[PDB]
Design a protein around this ligand. Structure first.
Ligand SMILES: [Mg+2]
Ligand SMILES: [Zn+2]
Lengths: 614, 1340
C-alpha cells in the first residue's frame, strides 16, 4: 500500500513534490499593468527573496554578518526596500493556476512591488489561464539559478507565447470590456454634432472630442497618411481624404504603419478585432503586435468608461404583438386537441403537431422582437426623418459579440422556448414568460430541472476530461524529435474534407506549414509549382490559392522514416512561433495537452445542386 | 400589531391574502426527540418499545427470569449555559426499574423469590437543548435527518446494459429494516434466480423447497393446466376459447362434428368469434399435436406401482402408448406459449440440482458456510434465523404496509416475519410483470424514500447496546450463581454510554454546527442527507438518482443544494413540509367544494397527491373561492393541463410552499434563473456578522420568522415591564395575569457577550428595549448576531451604479469607495482560542511558575505572578502566552556545584521551558481566560478571581429576588401592624428592621406577627441554602481526562477590516473580489454631489441571467428616495399633521394590498418614533411570486420625485465631464462572505522540513510549500525547461546537501547548483530492498 497507489508514493512524493520558495493568493484585475508584468505584494516578495536580500546587504557592506542582515530585514528600513526594488528589477517569477490543463498554465512575469495582499494579473492573459475573479487562487514560484532566469525570459515569457500550441490562432484576443469600448467608438450615427466637417488629422479630432465641440461618432472627411511596405521592405506613404467617424481616427492614432486604413473603417466587432490582430502580426511582427495590443486595451478601457453604458429595466422592450401570437397559438392548440378527442389522429401525431406549431410561434415572436429592437432609432435629419442601426445598449451588447448571443437575447426579452424533461422528452407547453416578466411555479420548476442537469453534467464532464487527458499525456510522453531530416519522399495525399453540402474546411488552412511530399504541377503538366519538400508558409498557400490545386500530398509524421522519434521536416512548422520545428522539442506532451485542454465542452427524395456545375 | 412591530412597520407589497401562517420552522427536531423520550403507557415509539423488544431475559433454562417495569430520566446536574461554559456534555442520568424473579427448580412454576431493584442506573443519555441541538463536549453538534430507501419490495428493470442485446431482465428486491436482503432476478433463459444478499444466483425454486413444498404442490400453485381427454378414441382436449388469442393453426381444428379451422389457415378473428359464440369446450386433436407436449404430474402405474413418466418429462411415442394402454383418460400438460406464458418454474426445476428438502437445506448451508459438513439441524437453525427469525429479520409496520400494498392486499397490518405466502405472491407478481401485466417502480418516488430522523436512529443504536448487554448478562446469569448477586453488580453502564457517545460524537451525520449566521444554523438543522450508514456513495451514484423528481413539489426545495461534487445529494427541505406518521413527506393543500374553495386544509403524501387534480396558488379567487377564469391550469398525475372550474379537487396553500427558507429569503426570485439562485443561496449561507447590522431595504417578509425561530434572539416568555436595563442583563417585572400565585418573583435575562463560535466569529447580543417599556409575550428583547429588532440583517445596503470605470470592474471584480472603509461599516471581529495543558509526566509534573530559564524580563513584563497574561494586554506573534517549565532529572551536581547553585539560586529542576507562545503572525487582545484544574491542592489565584467574578453576579441575582420578596414581606408586616392599634407616625420614621422587635396587644395578631417573623427566618434560610448549593456547584472541579493536571484557555479577539482581495457578493449570484479602494474625489457623483459607493460591471447581467438585481436596484433607489424625502420633511419639524398625511398617502399607494396600517398609533409620540426609525428609508417586502410589478415601482419612484425610468445623469468624479446615456443607480443589499484574504494569503522562502522524507512540511499552520504536481511537470516538459525543472525537483525540495550548499551559494552572490540524487529516491530503493528484490545502482 505504501508503494502502490496515489496516497502512497510515485504520484504523491516522486511526481507531486512540494517545492520551496512558493506562495499562493487571490488574483485581481490590475488594469494599469503592462502585458509583460504582474503586481506582487511587498511582504510576500520580501519573504521569498530573503536570502537575495541578505546577500546584497552583505555585498554592500551595510551588514557585517548574516544575523545583522536578518535584524535589518526585521526592522524594515528604507534601505531594505531600495535594495529589494533593485534586486527585483529583471528577475522573473512563475505564475501557475491550479488546473494546469495546457502549457499556458505556467507563465513568467516581471513583478512590480505593490501594497495590498492580492496578486494583480494582467487582463489579457486571463483567457489563457481560464481565470476568473471570483475567489480563484494562484501559486507563485521563484526561479533561482541563472539558467532558470534565461529559460523563464526566453521560453516562458508572455510576449513569446501569443499563439496557442493547439491551433495557430491568437490566444490573447480582447475579451469583453475592450471589445465593447472599441465597438462603441467605431459605430457611426446618421446625424449628430459636427456632421460632415473636414479635419486635417486625428489630433484635431481629439481636440474637438475632448472639448465637447464634436461627437465621438459623426461622419467626416479626414486626410490621412497610411504607410505600406509594398516594395522590398520600404514604406510608402499614401495620403488621401476618407469619409469615416471621429472614433475610428482616434483609434487610428495607435495603429502602426503597415496596416491598411480599411481595417478600422468598419463596425469593428469581435471578429474584426481578431483579424486585425492577425494581420498586424503577419505584416509587422511580434513587438509591434505586443505594443498595439497594450494600446488597444488602454484605449478601450478609457473610452468604455467615458461611454457610460448601463442597463435599465426599460431598456429591454417587450414586443407589442407577443400576446396576440401566443393567444393565436393557444387557440390553434385547442382546435388540434379537440380534433384529437374525436379520434381522427393518434396521440403521437397530435404531440408532433403541437410541438411544431409551438416552435413556429417561438420563431415568430423571436423575429418580431428582433425587428422591434434592432433598427428602431428614427432620429431626424434637417427635415424629414430616417432610421439607422439603433444605439440600444442591450442591442450593442448583442451585436458587438461582447456578451450574449441571439439565444440569450431571446431568453431575456422573448419566450424562453421548449424544455426537456428528465428522459429527454420535451414538455408540451413551453415557458411563455421571460425574466423581465415573472414566471410561475411550474415553468420555474422545469427550468430548475434543466439547470440542475446542466450543472451535474459539467461536474462529471470535468472529471472525465481530466482523466482522459492524464492518459493521453501519459502515453505520448517519451516521443522526441531526434533527427533533423530522415529524407523520405513518402507522405499522405491531403484533400479538403467536403462533408456533404459544402466545404466545411478549405485546403489552404489544412496545408499551411506542412512540407510537401513531391512537387505539385499546375493543371498543366511540366509546370512545377513547388520544388521537392518545402515548408508551406502563408506565401505558398496564397500562391496555391491563385492557382486551382485541389489535393496535395504532404509529408506526415506517421510516414516519417526516422528511428526512435521524428525528423523536423516530416513534422512541419506549426508552433506558438512561426518557424520550422526545432530539434529536441517534446511534441508528444504538447500534442496531448492541446488535445486535452479544449476537452471540457464535449424523406430524402431528390438531390439538389446548390451551385451551377457539371 | 405587536409592540416591537409597532416600533418599525415594513411596507408590504403583495396582492394575495395569506391564509396560512408559516409553521414553526424547527418542528422536525423538537417533535422527533419529544416522540423519542415521551414516557407513554401503550408501547408506541419510545424506549419502552425497545425494552419490551429485548425483555424478558430468561436464563439458559435456569429458571431465573428478569423483568422490566419502567424507566426514569434523572435530573440533569448541569444546566445548558453553565454546561457549555464548563466544557462538559449536557445530559440526563437514565434509571430503569427491574425485578429479578427466581422460581422453584423442581416444582410447578411459581415465583419463589422476587426482588425489586431500587431504580438501577444504567448510564447517561444526552438531552437536546431548547433549540434542538446537542452539547457533547462543550461543542454544539447537529444530527441531520437521513433520507433512505424504505423497507419493502421493489421491481426494477435494469435494461440497456444487459449483454447489449436488449433482454430486459427484471428483479424484485426485498429490503428489511433489520435483517439480510433478498433478491430475485431473471436470466436470458427466463429462469428466475435468487441471490442471497450479495452472493451467486441460484435457481429460485430452492427456497420453495426450503419452505417444505413438494414439486407437485409447486407445479399446481404456479402453472395453468391443459387437459387432454380420451373419449372413445383419439385424444380430445378441453379448451377455453379465449386462450386461442393469436396462433397460426398447425393442424385441422375440427370440433363437435364440423371442421372450424382448416389445416393451414391461421386462426382469424372471424374464426375466433365463431368459436367463442359457439361455446366450444372440447375438441378432438391429432396425435401429432400431443406428440410434443410435456407432462405435469408424476403419473405412476396405479396397478403395479412401477413409475413410467416423471413430473415435467418430455413426451415420446412410447410414453404416449403406455399411457393410453394404462387407461389414463385425463392428461395434464403444461401451457408453454413462448410469447406470453413461459415454462419458467419448469426450466428452473431443470437447472435446479436439488430434489429433496434435505438436499435444498444442505445446498443453502453450503452457500452460507462453505466448507464445513452441514448437519440437518445446523442448516435448519441457520435458515430459520436468516429470513424468518423475528429478532434478526424485521421489515416494519411501514415495511409491512408497503409489502401488502405491493401485492395489492387491503390489509395494512401484518406479521413482521416473512411468511411463505408472501414469497409465493412476490414471485407470482414478478413473473406477472415479466409477462407485461404490471408496471415497474421508480426509485425516485418519494413514496419509496423514507426519512429517518434523530430519535429513530438513537433508538436503533440503543437497541444495539441492549442486545450487547443482554447477551452478556445472559451468560453471566447462566454461568454464575443465581441467588447471590443483587441487581447492580450484574448490569454495567459502560457499554451503553460508550455506544451512545460513539454515535453522537464520531459519526458522519453528527457534525459541528455551521455557526456564523442565523440562516446557517436554521438551514443546517433542517437538512436531509442521503449519505451516512446504508447510503449510496457519491461516485457510485448515478445521474438519475441526483435528478429532481416531479414528486419533490412542495416538499423539498428544488434549488437549494450545494453546487460542489455532491450536488443533488443534499436537497434542503422546503418551508411548509412535515413528516408523516411513518416518516414520509406530506404537504398541505386547500380543499375544493365543487364550486367554492373552502378553508379546510389536508396534508397529502406523494401517492395520495398523485391521484387528485390540484389547483395552483396563483389562481384568481374573488371573495368566495370562485375562479375568475372558466378554464384554469392544474396538475393531476404529475402533469399539468387545463381543467374546468367545477373540476379542481385541491389548491396550493401558498406560493412559498415549493421552496426552502433560503430561497424564500431572496427577493425577486421569480426573475432569477434557477442556477444563479442556487449559487446565491449557497453562498449567502456563508455571510459573517458585521459590527452593527441594520436591515435589508429589499426583503421578503420572512425575516422575522427566521430570526425569531432561531435561538439567537432573546424573546420574552412572560410579558411585563422592563425594570432594569444593562448591557449584560434585562430585568422585567411580570404582569399580574401570567404571575404565578405562589413564589413568582420577577424575570431576569442574562445576556452573553463575546464568545468564540465554531467558525471563529463573534457572538454578541445587544438590548433593544429601554427602562419602563411594556413588553408582551413573544417580542424581541435582545438582538442576536446580525439581526435588528427581530429582523434578519445579514449584510448592508449601499448605493451602487452600473457602469465600467476604466476596467477596474473588468470581470466580476468589484470597485469600492474609500468612504466605505472610512465609515467602518464592513469590519468584522474574529476570535481565536488557545489552550495550554500541564500534564503529569513520570519524571515529574511540569510547573506553571513565572521563573523561566533564559528569558528576558521583557517577556515576563506582561505576566502576573501566577504566570497568566493580564486581561486587556496587547500581544503580538511570538510572545509567551503562558509560562510552563519542563522538569529535568539526574542532574547529579557536585557538592561544591550544589553550593554554588544554592547561593546563585539556579534551579536544577528546571532548565527547560514548555511555555506556550502566540502563533506566528497573529496579534490581538486577550479578552478572556479560563482555568480547569483536575486535582489542584487549592484553587489558584486566577481561579479565585474567576470564581469571584461569576459568583458576585450570581449573588447579585439571588439578592435582587430576595430583596423583592423582603420588600413584600415588610409591606405585609406593616399592614398587619396597622391592625391591632394603628401606628404610622412613629413607625415610618424608625428603621424597618425595628418592626419585628416591636410588639402589640396579646391576641391572634401576636400569633400573626410570630408567623411573619418565622416566615422571614424561613426566607433567609432558604435563600442561604440555595446560595450555598449554587456556590458548591460553581466551585467544584469539572472532571478532566486521566493524566492532565490542569488546562488554561485564552481567547484572543481581532478586528479585521475589509481590504483588497476579500470576496463580496450579492443575493442574486453576482460575485466579486474587491479590487481597489478609490479616493472619495475620484468616485462618480450626481449633480447633487452624493458619490456612489460601488461601481458594478453591467456585462455580468446578460450572460448571467439574473434580472432580480435590476429590479432590486430600482426599488432600493425608490425606498431611499422616500426615506430622503421623509428626512427632509422631518429635519424642519413642520408638524405631526403633515407627517401623518404624507406617511398615509405613502402607505396606501394604490389598492388591492393586504397592508391596513397607520393612524391607530398614539397621535404624537409613537408616530414620531416610527418616523425616526423610517427616516433612514422605509423597508419593503416583496414576496417571492406575489411581487411588485413594474408599474408599482414607477409609482414609487414618482412619489419620491425621481425619474420614473430609473436612470439619472451622472458626473465623472475625476474629470467632471458628463457621461452620455444616463445610467441606473440605486441601493442594493450586499453581503461580505467568510473568505478573507489574510487567511488565504501565504508564502515561504525556507523553513522546517519533514521528518522521514526531508521535504518541507505540508500545511498553513507550519509554513508549508505549494504542491508542484505532475500536470505542472508536464506543462514544463512542453517547453524545453530542463534546468528549472531539475532545480525544482532536487535543490528546492529533496537534496539535503544540495539545499544547504545552494543556500550558502545564493548568500555568496553566485547562482549555480549541484543536483545530486533525491533522498526520496533512496527511500524508494530502501523500501524495495526490504522486499526480496535486489535493486542496485550500477557503475562502470
Ligand atoms: Mg473563480
Ligand atoms: Zn521524417
Amino acid at each position: 500500500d505504501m508503494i502502490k497507489g496515489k496516497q502512497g508514493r510515485f504520484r504523491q512524493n516522486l511526481l507531486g513534490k512540494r517545492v520551496d520558495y512558493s506562495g499562493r493568493s487571490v488574483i485581481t484585475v490590475g488594469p494599469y499593468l503592462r502585458l509583460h508584468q504582474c503586481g506582487l505584494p511587498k511582504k510576500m516578495a520580501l519573504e521569498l527573496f530573503k536570502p537575495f536580500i541578505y546577500g546584497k546587504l552583505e555585498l554592500r557592506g551595510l551588514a557585517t554578518t548574516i544575523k545583522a542582515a536578518k535584524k535589518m530585514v526585521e526592522r524594515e528600513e528604507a534601505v531594505v526596500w531600495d535594495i529589494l526594488d533593485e534586486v527585483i528589477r529583471e528577475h522573473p517569477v512563475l505564475l501557475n493556476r491550479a488546473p494546469t490543463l495546457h502549457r499556458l498554465g505556467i507563465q513568467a512575469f516581471e513583478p512590480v512591488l505593490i501594497e495590498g495582499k492580492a496578486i494583480q494579473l494582467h487582463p489579457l492573459v486571463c483567457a489563457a489561464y481560464n481565470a476568473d475573479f471570483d475567489g480563484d487562487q494562484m501559486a507563485v514560484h521563484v526561479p533561482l539559478t541563472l539558467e532558470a532566469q534565461l529559460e523563464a525570459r526566453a521560453l516562458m515569457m508572455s510576449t513569446n507565447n501569443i499563439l496557442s500550441p493547439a491551433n495557430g490562432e491568437p490566444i490573447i484576443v480582447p475579451s469583453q470590456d475592450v471589445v465593447l469600448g472599441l465597438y462603441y467608438m467605431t459605430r457611426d450615427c446618421v446625424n449628430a454634432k459636427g456632421e460632415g466637417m473636414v479635419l486635417t488629422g486625428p489630433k484635431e479630432a481629439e481636440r474637438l472630442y475632448r472639448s465637447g465641440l464634436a461627437s465621438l461618432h459623426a461622419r467626416v472627411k479626414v486626410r490621412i497618411t497610411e504607410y505600406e511596405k509594398d516594395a522590398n521592405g520600404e514604406l510608402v506613404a499614401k495620403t488621401s481624404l476618407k469619409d469615416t467617424t471621429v472614433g475610428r481616427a482616434i483609434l487610428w492614432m495607435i495603429v502602426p504603419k503597415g496596416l491598411p486604413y480599411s481595417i478600422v473603417n468598419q463596425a469593428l466587432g469581435k471578429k474584426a478585432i481578431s483579424k486585425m490582430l492577425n494581420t498586424c502580426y503577419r505584416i509587422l511582427g511580434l513587438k509591434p503586435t505586443v505594443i498595439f495590443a497594450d494600446q488597444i486595451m488602454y484605449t478601450g478601457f478609457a473610452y468604455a468608461a467615458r461611454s457610460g453604458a448601463s442597463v435599465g429595466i426599460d431598456d429591454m422592450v417587450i414586443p407589442e404583438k407577443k400576446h396576440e401570437i401566443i393567444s393565436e397559438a393557444e387557440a390553434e392548440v385547442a382546435e388540434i386537441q379537440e380534433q384529437f378527442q374525436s379520434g381522427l389522429v393518434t396521440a403521437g401525431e397530435r404531440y408532433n403537431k403541437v410541438i411544431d406549431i409551438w416552435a413556429a410561434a417561438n420563431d415568430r415572436v423571436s423575429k418580431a422582437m428582433m425587428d422591434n429592437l434592432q433598427t428602431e432609432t428614427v432620429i431626424n435629419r434637417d427635415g424629414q426623418e430616417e432610421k439607422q442601426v439603433s444605439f440600444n445598449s442591450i442591442y450593442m451588447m448583442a451585436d458587438s459579440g461582447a456578451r450574449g448571443s441571439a439565444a440569450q437575447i431571446r431568453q431575456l426579452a422573448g419566450m424562453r422556448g421548449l424544455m426537456a424533461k428528465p428522459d429527454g422528452s420535451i414538455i408540451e407547453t413551453p415557458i411563455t414568460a421571460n425574466f423581465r416578466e415573472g414566471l410561475n411555479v411550474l415553468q420555474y420548476f422545469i427550468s430548475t430541472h434543466g439547470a440542475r442537469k446542466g450543472l451535474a453534467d459539467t461536474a462529471l464532464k470535468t472529471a472525465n476530461s481530466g482523466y482522459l487527458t492524464r492518459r493521453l499525456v501519459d502515453v505520448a510522453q517519451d516521443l522526441v524529435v531526434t533527427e533533423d531530416d530522415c529524407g523520405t519522399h513518402e507522405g499522405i495525399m491531403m484533400t479538403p474534407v467536403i462533408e456533404g453540402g459544402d466545404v466545411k474546411e478549405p485546403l489552404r488552412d489544412r496545408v499551411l506549414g506542412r512540407v510537401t511530399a513531391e512537387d505539385v504541377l499546375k493543371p498543366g503538366t511540366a509546370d512545377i509549382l513547388v520544388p521537392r519538400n518545402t515548408l508551406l508558409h502563408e506565401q505558398w498557400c496564397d500562391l496555391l490559392e491563385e492557382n486551382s490545386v485541389d489535393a496535395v500530398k504532404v509529408r506526415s509524421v506517421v510516414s516519417c522514416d526516422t528511428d526512435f522519434g521524428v525528423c523536423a521536416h516530416c513534422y512541419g512548422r506549426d508552433l506558438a512561433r512561426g518557424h520550422i520545428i526545432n530539434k529536441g522539442e517534446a511534441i508528444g506532451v504538447i500534442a496531448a495537452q492541446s488535445i486535452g485542454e479544449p476537452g471540457t465542452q464535449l424523406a430524402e427524395s431528390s438531390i439538389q445542386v446548390k451551385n451551377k456545375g457539371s | 400589531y405587536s409592540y416591537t412591530e409597532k416600533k418599525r412597520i415594513r411596507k408590504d407589497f403583495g396582492k394575495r391574502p395569506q391564509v396560512l401562517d408559516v409553521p414553526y420552522l424547527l418542528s422536525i427536531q423538537l417533535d422527533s426527540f419529544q416522540k423519542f423520550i415521551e414516557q407513554d403507557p401503550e408501547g408506541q415509539y419510545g424506549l419502552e418499545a425497545a425494552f419490551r423488544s429485548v425483555f424478558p431475559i430468561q436464563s439458559y433454562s435456569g429458571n431465573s427470569e428478569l423483568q422490566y417495569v419502567s424507566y426514569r430520566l434523572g435530573e440533569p446536574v448541569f444546566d445548558v449555559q453553565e454546561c457549555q461554559i464548563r466544557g462538559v456534555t449536557y445530559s440526563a442520568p437514565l434509571r430503569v426499574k427491574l425485578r429479578l424473579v427466581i422460581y422453584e427448580r423442581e416444582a410447578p412454576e411459581g415465583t419463589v423469590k422476587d426482588i425489586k431493584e431500587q431504580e438501577v442506573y444504567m448510564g447517561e443519555i444526552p438531552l437536546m437543548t431548547d433549540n434542538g441541538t446537542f452539547v457533547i463536549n462543550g461543542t454544539e453538534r447537529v444530527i441531520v435527518s437521513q433520507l433512505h430507501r424504505s423497507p419493502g419490495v421493489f421491481f426494477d428493470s435494469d435494461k440497456g446494459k444487459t449483454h447489449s442485446s436488449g433482454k430486459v431482465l427484471y428483479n424484485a428486491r426485498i429490503i428489511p429494516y433489520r435483517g439480510s436482503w433478498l433478491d430475485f432476478e431473471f436470466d436470458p433463459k427466463d429462469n428466475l434466480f435468487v441471490r442471497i444478499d450479495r452472493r451467486r444466483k441460484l435457481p429460485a425454486t430452492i427456497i420453495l423447497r426450503a419452505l417444505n413444498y413438494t414439486t407437485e404442490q409447486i407445479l399446481d400453485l404456479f402453472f395453468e393446466k391443459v387437459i387432454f381427454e380420451i373419449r372413445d378414441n383419439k385424444l380430445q382436449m378441453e379448451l377455453v376459447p379465449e386462450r386461442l388469442r393469436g396462433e397460426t393453426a398447425s393442424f385441422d381444428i375440427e370440433a363437435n362434428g364440423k371442421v372450424y379451422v382448416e389445416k393451414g389457415r391461421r386462426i382469424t378473428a372471424r374464426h375466433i368469434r365463431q368459436l367463442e359464440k359457439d361455446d366450444v369446450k372440447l375438441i378432438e386433436v391429432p396425435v401429432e399435436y400431443i406428440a410434443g407436449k410435456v407432462v405435469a404430474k408424476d403419473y405412476i402405474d396405479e396397478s403395479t406401482g412401477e413409475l413410467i413418466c416423471a413430473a415435467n418429462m418430455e413426451l415420446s411415442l412410447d410414453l404416449l402408448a403406455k399411457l393410453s394402454q394404462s387407461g389414463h383418460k385425463r392428461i395434464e400438460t403444461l401451457f408453454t406459449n413462448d410469447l406470453d406464458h413461459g415454462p419458467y418454474i419448469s426450466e428452473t426445476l431443470r437447472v435446479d440440482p436439488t430434489n429433496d428438502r434435505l438436499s435444498a437445506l444442505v445446498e443453502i448451508y453450503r452457500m452460507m458456510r462453505p466448507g464445513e459438513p452441514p448437519t440437518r439441524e445446523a442448516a435448519e437453525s441457520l435458515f430459520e434465523n436468516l429470513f424468518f427469525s423475528e429478532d434478526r429479520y424485521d421489515l416494519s409496520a411501514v415495511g409491512r404496509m408497503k409489502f401488502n400494498r405491493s401485492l395489492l392486499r387491503e390489509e395494512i397490518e401484518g406479521s413482521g416475519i416473512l411468511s411463505k405466502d408472501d414469497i409465493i405472491d412476490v414471485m407470482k407478481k414478478l413473473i406477472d410483470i415479466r409477462n407485461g401485466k404490471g408496471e415497474v417502480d421508480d426509485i425516485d418516488h418519494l413514496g419509496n424514500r423514507r426519512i429517518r430522523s434523530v430519535g429513530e436512529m438513537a433508538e436503533n443504536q440503543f437497541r444495539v447496546g441492549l442486545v450487547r448487554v443482554e447477551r452478556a448478562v445472559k451468560e453471566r446469569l447462566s454461568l454464575g450463581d443465581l441467588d447471590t448477586l443483587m441487581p447492580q453488580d450484574m448490569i454495567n453502564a459502560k457499554p451503553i454510554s460508550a455506544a451512545v457517545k460513539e454515535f453522537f460524537g464520531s459519526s458522519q451525520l453528527s457534525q459541528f454546527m455551521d455557526q456564523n449566521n442565523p440562516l446557517s444554523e436554521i438551514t443546517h438543522k433542517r437538512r436531509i442527507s442521503a449519505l451516512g450508514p446504508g447510503g449510496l456513495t457519491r461516485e457510485r451514484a448515478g445521474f438519475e438518482v441526483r435528478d429532481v423528481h416531479p414528486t419533490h413539489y412542495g416538499r423539498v426545495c428544488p434549488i437549494e443544494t450545494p453546487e460542489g461534487p455532491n450536488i443533488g445529494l443534499i436537497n434542503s427541505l422546503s418551508v411548509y413540509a412535515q413528516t408523516n406518521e411513518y416518516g414520509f413527506l406530506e404537504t398541505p393543500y386547500r380543499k375544493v367544494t365543487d364550486g367554492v374553495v373552502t378553508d379546510e386544509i389536508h396534508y397529502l403524501s406523494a401517492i395520495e397527491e398523485g391521484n387528485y387534480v390540484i389547483a395552483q396558488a396563483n389562481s384568481n379567487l374573488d371573495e368566495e373561492g370562485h375562479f375568475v377564469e372558466d378554464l384554469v391550469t392544474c396538475r393531476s398525475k404529475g402533469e399539468s393541463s387545463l381543467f374546468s372550474r367545477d373540476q379542481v379537487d385541491y389548491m396550493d396553500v401558498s406560493t412559498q410552499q415549493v421552496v426552502s427558507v433560503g430561497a424564500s429569503l431572496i427577493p425577486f426570485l421569480e426573475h432569477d434563473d434557477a442556477n444563479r439562485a442556487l449559487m446565491g443561496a449557497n453562498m449567502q449561507r456563508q455571510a459573517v456578522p458585521t459590527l452593527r447590522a441594520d436591515k435589508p431595504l429589499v426583503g421578503t417578509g420572512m425575516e422575522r420568522a427566521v430570526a425569531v425561530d432561531s435561538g439567537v434572539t432573546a424573546v420574552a416568555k412572560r410579558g411585563g415591564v422592563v425594570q432594569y436595563v444593562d448591557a449584560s442583563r434585562i430585568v422585567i417585572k411580570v404582569n399580574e395575569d401570567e404571575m404565578y400565585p405562589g413564589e413568582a418573583g420577577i424575570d431576569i435575562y442574562n445576556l452573553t457577550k463575546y464568545t468564540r463560535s465554531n467558525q471563529n466569529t463573534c457572538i454578541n447580543q445587544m438590548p433593544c428595549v429601554s427602562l419602563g417599556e411594556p413588553v408582551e409575550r413573544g417580542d424581541v428583547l435582545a438582538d442576536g448576531p446580525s439581526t435588528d429588532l427581530g429582523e434578519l440583517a445579514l449584510g448592508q445596503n449601499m448605493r451602487v451604479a452600473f457602469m465600467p470605470w476604466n476596467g477596474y470592474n473588468f470581470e466580476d471584480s468589484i470597485l469600492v469607495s474609500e468612504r466605505v472603509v472610512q465609515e467602518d461599516r464592513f469590519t468584522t471581529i474574529h476570535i481565536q482560542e488557545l489552550a495550554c495543558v500541564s500534564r503529569d509526566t513520570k519524571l515529574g509534573p511540569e510547573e506553571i511558575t513565572a521563573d523561566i530559564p533564559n528569558v528576558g524580563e521583557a517577556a515576563l513584563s506582561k505576566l502576573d505572578e501566577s504566570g497568566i497574561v493580564y486581561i486587556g494586554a496587547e500581544v503580538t506573534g511570538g510572545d509567551i502566552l503562558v509560562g510552563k517549565v519542563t522538569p529535568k532529572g539526574e542532574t547529579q551536581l557536585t557538592p561544591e556545584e550544589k553550593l554554588l547553585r544554592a547561593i546563585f539560586g539556579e534551579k536544577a529542576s528546571d532548565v527547560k521551558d514548555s511555555s506556550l507562545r502566540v502563533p506566528n503572525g497573529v496579534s490581538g487582545t486577550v479578552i478572556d481566560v479560563q482555568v480547569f484544574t483536575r486535582d489542584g491542592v487549592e484553587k489558584d489565584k486566577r481561579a479565585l478571581e474567576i470564581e469571584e467574578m461569576q459568583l458576585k453576579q450570581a449573588k447579585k441575582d439571588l439578592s435582587e429576588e430576595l430583596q423583592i420578596l423582603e420588600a413584600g414581606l415588610f409591606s405585609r408586616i406593616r399592614a398587619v401592624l396597622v391592625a391591632g392599634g394603628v401606628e404610622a407616625e412613629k413607625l415610618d420614621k424608625l428603621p424597618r428592621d425595628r418592626w419585628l422587635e416591636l410588639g402589640l396587644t396579646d391576641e391572634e395578631k401576636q400569633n400573626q406577627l410570630e408567623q411573619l417573623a418565622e416566615q422571614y427566618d424561613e426566607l433567609k434560610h432558604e435563600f442561604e441554602k440555595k446560595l450555598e448549593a449554587k456556590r458548591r456547584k460553581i466551585t467544584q472541579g469539572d472532571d478532566l481526562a486521566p493524566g492532565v493536571l490542569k488546562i488554561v484557555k485564552v481567547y484572543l479577539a481581532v478586528k479585521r477590516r475589509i481590504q483588497p482581495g476579500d470576496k463580496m457578493a450579492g443575493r442574486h449570484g453576482n460575485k466579486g473580489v474587491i479590487s481597489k479602494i478609490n479616493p472619495i474625489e475620484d468616485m462618480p457623483y450626481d449633480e447633487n454631489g452624493t458619490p456612489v459607493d460601488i461601481v458594478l460591471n453591467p456585462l455580468g447581467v446578460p450572460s448571467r441571467m439574473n434580472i432580480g438585481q435590476i429590479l432590486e436596484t430600482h426599488l432600493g433607489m425608490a425606498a431611499k428616495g422616500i426615506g430622503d424625502k421623509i428626512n427632509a420633511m422631518l429635519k424642519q419639524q413642520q408638524e405631526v399633521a403633515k407627517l401623518r398625511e404624507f406617511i398615509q398617502r405613502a402607505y396606501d399607494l394604490g389598492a388591492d394590498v393586504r397592508q391596513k396600517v397607520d393612524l391607530s398609533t398614539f397621535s404624537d409620540e409613537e408616530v414620531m418614533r416610527l418616523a425616526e426609525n423610517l427616516r433612514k428609508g422605509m423597508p419593503i417586502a416583496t414576496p417571492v411570486f406575489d411581487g411588485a410589478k413594474e408599474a408599482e415601482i414607477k409609482e414609487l419612484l414618482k412619489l419620491g420625485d425621481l425619474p420614473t425610468s430609473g436612470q439619472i445623469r451622472l458626473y465623472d468624479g475625476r474629470t467632471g465631464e458628463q457621461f452620455e446615456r444616463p445610467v441606473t443607480v440605486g441601493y442594493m443589499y450586499m453581503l461580505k462572505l467568510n473568505h478573507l484574504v489574510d487567511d488565504k494569503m501565504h508564502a515561504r522562502s525556507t523553513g522546517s522540513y519533514s521528518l522521514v522524507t526531508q521535504q518541507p512540511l505540508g500545511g498553513k499552520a507550519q509554513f508549508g510549500g505549494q504542491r508542484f504536481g505532475e500536470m505542472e511537470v508536464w506543462a514544463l516538459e512542453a517547453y524545453g525547461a530542463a534546468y528549472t525543472l531539475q532545480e525544482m525537483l532536487t535543490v528546492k525540495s529533496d537534496d539535503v546537501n544540495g539545499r544547504t550548499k545552494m543556500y550558502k551559494n545564493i548568500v555568496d552572490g553566485n547562482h549555480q547548483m549541484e543536483p545530486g540524487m533525491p533522498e526520496s529516491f533512496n527511500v524508494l530503493l530502501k523500501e524495495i530492498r526490504s522486499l526480496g528484490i535486489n535493486i542496485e545502482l550500477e557503475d562502470e
